[PDB]
Every structure is written in C-alpha cells, then in structure tokens.
C-alpha cells in the first residue's frame, strides 16, 4: 500500500505546485502588451541558397563569428559554409551517415555531430596537416544523439534518445554528469547565455531546466500536449520558447515558473520542428512541417511575416549572434539565408 | 587589398576542390541503394542478416549494384522519432514471424503505423513472413488455434489466384494467405500508388531472400519511374 500512498503524495505535491503557480499568475503578458504598438509586417527575402547536400539537412549551427555555419545531412557529409561568399570551407565525411545534430564550438576550433550511431564525434578543424579528422569520440549513450551544444572546447552537453542528457569532458572522453528525469526521449536542448543552467524538451511534453554544475532538474515546465521538438532560450536568459507536435509555440518563464504565451493559429496544424529568437528577442522564428517558417513577435500572439521558399519541411533554423540573418535548413537539401 | 584578393582566391580554390570531391561523392551515393531492416528480436531478422552499436550497416552486392542495409539495434521501443530518418530509403524490409500468433497483432499495428505515417507515405515496404515451417507444423499439430486469435480466419477461404506449395496441406496455405491478406488489407486500405507492399513467404533455410529483395527493389524503382512518365 506504500506505492499507492506515495503516488497520492506525488499528486498532492503536484496540486500544491499548480496552486502556487495559479496564485502567482494574476495578469497575463497579453494584457500588459496590449498597450504597446504592434510591429509592422516583416518581409524577409532569400539572400543566399547553399547547395551541395545530397540528402535531407537534419541540422545546422551558426558560428560565433556569425560568418561560418556548419550543416549536417543524411548523405554522410558535414559541410562548413562561408555564408558571405557561399563557399564551402570544409566537407567532412562521417563514419555513420545517419546524423541528426551538429554543433559549432564558440571558439570555432571544433565541430561535433551525432545521430543514430548513439555516438557524439568531435572533429578538429585546426589540425597541423590541415585535414579535418576525428579528435575524440564520445560513446556512452544508449539512444540516438538528438542534440549537442558546446559549453567550450573542453566540455560538451548532449541530449539523447535514451531519455538522458549528459555532460561530457572532451579530453578524457567520459561523461562527468548525467541528467535524468525525462520519461520520454530528449529532442532538443538550449544553453543559456551563461553556461550555468540549460533547458531540454522531451517527448513527454515537458521541458526541464537543469543546472550544469550541480546536475539536477531545477524545475519542470508542462504546458504542451505532444512531443517537444524545438526549445530555444530567450536572449535575456530568463525565459525560453518551445515548439511542439500539437502545432503551437509556448513561451515559458524561468522565474515565474509558468507559460506566458501560446503562439498558435487555426490554419496551421503541423508540428514545429525548430524554433529560434531574434537578437532583441522581439521576434520568434519557428520552422514547420508545412514547408514554411512563420515569424511571431514574442510579446503579442499575432503573426507578422512568413518565410516561404522550401519545398520540403524545415528541419532546422538558426539566427546569427549579431541578428544579421536567419538560416533555414530543410529536407530538400538546401539552406537559405534570410536578412 | 591584395591580401584580401589572395585570401579570396585561396578559398575559391578550396571550394573548387571540395566541389570536385562532392561530385565524386554524389556519383557514389546515387548509385547505391539504402534499405531499412525492421523486425523483432525473435521474428528471425538475424537469419535474414546472415544471408547477404546504435545502428548496424551490412553491405551486400547483388548483380554489381551496391545495397546498404541498416538494422537498428540499440534504439528504444519508442520509434516515432527516429523512423522519420528512413523516409528517403529505397524500401523497408519488415520481418514478421508468421508462426507466432499475440505477436502478429502487434506486427500488424506496427505495419499500419509505418504505412500511414506522412513522412513514410512514398516509401515501399518489403514484407517477409518468417518461420513458415514453424507455422506449418503448428497448424498441422492444431495445438494453438488461429481462429481463437482472429475471428475472420474461420470463414477464410484460400484464394484461387494464390499458388499453393504442393507439399503443404491446404490448411497451412490458408493460414499463410490469411496472414498475407491481413497485411495486404492494411497496405491497400490507403496509398494512391505512392508506395506498395511486396509480401513474401520465407524460411530460415531459404537462400532466395537476397534475390527477392533485388527483384522488389527493381519493381519499386521501375514503378516510380513509370509513374514519373505517367505510364502507370
């Protein structure tokens, strides 16, 4: 009878948390933002079209210099692009062609990729001979790697399909910290502007905030109805946005422990694959299964702008550090830069 | 400056070299055919692997055409996320134990989920019904009853178009074609020519599996080309 009473205990704790959140919320952000002037209609035009991928582009990551970007495709290639001149800096063949994530180190000296092999591979771009090779290979996950982000050259954090996020030390190649608590597998993770804590979205329709140093889930966010595919941290670092398979975008607040806004429309019924913010955080950029990328101002629920031009679904989306442009990868093997 | 022009010329040369390598890689890539091998651990998938850690890659060349078959080993039972990767695949080889009947209901539900997935709507499925000898001996013994598991099997009659194996009795053939017709009902309930199912009866000792896969791959690509030209 211990299990039943402890489940009842958990139910009471969840009710207490819900009541505390309820008492915390008295005015929604829509009411506060009603008085503010709406942003005008925003039109983005394709500036560059990057060609050279033979299969679907599963992911892409910008560099901190805001000029280079790395893209991963199912053909087995990891290509580093020069966005200004549309030139390929590197083309890295991969041991396993099924890769679903790629990360560009903020220093720019390394580039990581991972996928159905359950391995996160680190590639050194600054080899003495000048040819990119595998520096270290991180093999500790029992599920497919779905996202990886560099904290710095020394350590990387990877989410996986085994419902686990791990903190790795590149030099020794072992995971120092293991993050657990997700019932479903983790699809995406977003690092905060400070490398102190990060958020992750899983298939249990819950987003969890983890502190990197002490390695436990600080809080859990549950507003979505289906698997969360894309989670993005607000520029300030006090909030984050999540994209789900229920065809809606939810803006969650770290300090208020609630969901402030829901970005949805009746016309759109497809899932959100990737989500990203602008430099000011005013605009929310979201990829979709309907082959288009909607633009939503983060303060009001109204849609202002649309990014069309992809034949297949938009798998990945990225905004540069300076906020100059937006890169969208899709399953049609093309990356488009929008300014 | 002249240094900027030098930098630009060097990166243009690097881009040209990368593009030549990419052309070679494109030629290599479009020649080979990728296959997804999906099945249970007790369905007899390893037997199919025999004749030819997150994912396993087996390379077999039939008639001088390269075929890359990938079998997922370390993935969890939840497969709604990583099954989307195999939507540009040539064909999905679905291995099912025709003897175990409730494993067949789970296999039918999995086949229905694969068939009706929007990303997998253009992907053809090659259906292998393994352990034919085990099903035959189980039906001949009559210990377990298929009718108990499926009500429709009782009134089911072996199709006249179906070609029976001379050795087997009519009841084993009837059970085999009942399972095949359940899978074919799922396959033909939806799909307006985008994809097709290619059922096959196979055994552990059968060495024809590779030739069968070759033939259904030929059929799939030929059908797609004919549809492209509006000849089918």
């Amino acid at each position, epitope marked *: 009878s211990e299990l039943d009473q402890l489940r009842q205990e958990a139910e009471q704790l969840k009710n207490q948390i819900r009541d505390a959140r309820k008492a915390c919320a008295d005015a929604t952000l829509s009411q506060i933002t009603n008085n503010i002037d709406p942003v005008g209609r925003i039109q983005m035009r394709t500036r560059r079209t990057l060609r050279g991928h033979l299969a679907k582009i599963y992911a892409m990551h910008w560099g901190t210099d805001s000029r280079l970007l790395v893209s991963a495709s199912q053909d087995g290639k990891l290509i580093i692009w020069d966005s200004y001149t549309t030139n390929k800096v590197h083309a890295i063949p991969l041991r396993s062609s099924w890769v679903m994530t790629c990360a560009y180190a903020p220093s720019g000296n390394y580039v990581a990729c991972g996928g159905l092999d359950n391995i996160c591979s680190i590639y050194n771009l600054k080899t003495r001979e000048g040819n990119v090779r595998v520096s270290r290979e991180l093999a500790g996950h029992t599920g497919y790697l779905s996202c990886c982000r560099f904290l710095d050259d020394n350590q990387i954090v990877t989410s996986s399909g085994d419902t686990t996020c791990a903190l790795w030390d590149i030099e020794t190649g072992q995971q120092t910290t293991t993050f657990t608590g997700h019932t479903g597998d983790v699809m995406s993770l977003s690092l905060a502007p400070d490398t102190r804590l990060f958020v992750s979205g899983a298939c*249990d329709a819950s987003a969890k905030l983890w502190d990197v140093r002490e390695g436990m889930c600080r809080q859990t966010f549950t507003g979505h*109805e289906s698997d969360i595919n894309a989670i993005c941290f607000f520029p300030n670092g006090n909030a984050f946005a999540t994209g789900s398979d229920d065809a809606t975008c939810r803006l969650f607040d770290l300090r208020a422990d609630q969901e402030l806004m829901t970005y949805s429309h009746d016309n759109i019924i497809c899932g959100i694959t990737s989500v990203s913010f602008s430099k000011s955080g005013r605009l929310l950029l979201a990829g979709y299964d309907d082959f288009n990328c909607n633009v939503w101002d983060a303060l009001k629920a109204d849609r202002a702008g649309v990014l069309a031009g992809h034949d297949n679904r938009v798998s990945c989306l990225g905004v540069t550090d300076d906020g100059m442009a937006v890169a969208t990868g899709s399953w049609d093997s093309f990356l488009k830069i929008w300014n | 400056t002249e240094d900027q022009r030098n930098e630009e010329k060097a990166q243009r040369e690097a881009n040209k070299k990368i593009e030549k390598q990419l052309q070679k890689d494109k030629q290599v890539y479009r020649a080979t055919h990728r296959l997804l091998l999906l099945g249970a651990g007790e369905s007899g998938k390893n037997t199919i692997v025999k004749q030819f850690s997150g994912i396993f890659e087996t390379k077999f060349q039939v008639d001088k055409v390269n075929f890359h078959m990938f079998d997922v080993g370390a993935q969890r039972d*939840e*497969r709604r996320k990583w099954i989307q990767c195999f939507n540009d695949v040539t064909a999905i080889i679905f291995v099912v134990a025709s003897s175990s009947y409730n494993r067949l209901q789970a296999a039918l*539900k999995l086949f*229905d989920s694969i068939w009706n997935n929007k990303w997998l709507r253009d992907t053809s499925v090659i259906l292998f019904l393994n352990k034919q000898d085990l099903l035959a001996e189980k039906v001949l013994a009559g210990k377990s009853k298929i009718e108990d598991y499926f009500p*429709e099997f009782a009134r089911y009659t072996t199709p006249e178009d179906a070609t029976p194996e001379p050795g087997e009795d009519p009841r084993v053939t009837r059970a085999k074609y009942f399972i095949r017709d359940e899978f074919l009902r799922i396959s033909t309930a939806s799909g307006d020519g985008r994809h097709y199912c290619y059922p096959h009866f196979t055994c552990a000792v059968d060495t024809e599996n590779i030739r069968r896969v070759f033939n259904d791959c030929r059929d799939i690509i030929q059908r797609m080309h004919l549809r492209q030209y509006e000849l089918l």
Partner: nanobody
Amino acid sequence: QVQLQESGGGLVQPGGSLRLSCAASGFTFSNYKMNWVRQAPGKGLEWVSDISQSGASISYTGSVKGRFTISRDNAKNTLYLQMNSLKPEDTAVYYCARCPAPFTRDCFDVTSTTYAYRGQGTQVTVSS
C-alpha cells in the same frame, strides 16, 4: 499537463458486464485518436482497441472482437470501454493510451513499455 485517469475496474464474475471510463484532461480531446491497452500478468502490453477522433473508425483486437465496444464523448472528454462478457484470460490492467500526435492517422509506440501519454490503468480481475 497531459493526464489520463482510468476508472471502473474491479473484480467481476465470468460473463459479467463491466464498463471502463477514462477521464482525460490537459489536451484537446477531439484532436487525438484514443486507444485501449492491457497488460496481462507476466506478459507485455498488448493493444485492445482504438477509436478515431470523430468516432467513425473503430477497430478491435481479434480476441475481443464482437465482445468489447469502445465509445468516446468529445464533449465530456472521456473514453469508454464496455465489456459485455469476458473470459478469465483477460485479467489484466487496462490503460487508456492517447496517440502521440494530433490529426495523425498512425498511432506509434502506444504499447511501448515507457509510453508517456498512457494512463495509470485499472486492474480488472476475472475469477470464479
């Protein structure tokens, strides 16, 4: 928060009528296809029945075909399973499992060991 609560499970005599009610909240009930799954003692989860979003398309497993009926009330956000008669074979816990995505024909991983959108379940026992 996606939660699914099952009710109406209990010990019954063989051949007796039993009705299972699943109360679902936290999502738009009309947008999703609902399922019923069961786990016999010492056995894995197996699929029993499902009903489409509108309720027009209904399917059952072969063991309970013509014996169990499944209905949903979109206004009341509840899923019903009526068991008119039952052999002592189906003495297992019955869960109401929602399909992972809305407006989708397929229902993936509904019988997985660690499916998130499955309910807690109710134990149904058949004994003489």
